[PDB]
Amino acid sequence: MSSLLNSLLPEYFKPKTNLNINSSRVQYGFNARIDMQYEDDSGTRKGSRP
């Protein structure tokens, strides 16, 4: 059931036709950007994981 399992993939990702698998192990993920903001009794601190 193609239309069922095709819906599970995320909206941003649309994969191409071919895939040359040449191993018994494949990592899959995404490269996201995190913008953290910290606050406590001592004070405030702002950072960013690129």
Partner: protein, 50 residues
């Protein structure tokens, strides 16, 4: 990390001769320039105290 006028160490009136050729670069952000030209405007904001 600030400059007070009392660092001159001379009460009274005087005129200063600034050496513009021997301007060393100790700590450089992207803002940092060596050659100023005309009317210099610097606008800074301080946030995230801890």
């Amino acid at each position: 990390g600030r400059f007070l006028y009392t660092d001159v160490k001379y009460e009274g009136q005087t005129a200063f001769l600034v050496d513009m050729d021997t301007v060393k670069a100790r700590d450089h952000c992207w803002v940092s320039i060596v050659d100023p030209n005309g009317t210099m405007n610097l606008s800074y904001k301080m946030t995230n105290f801890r």
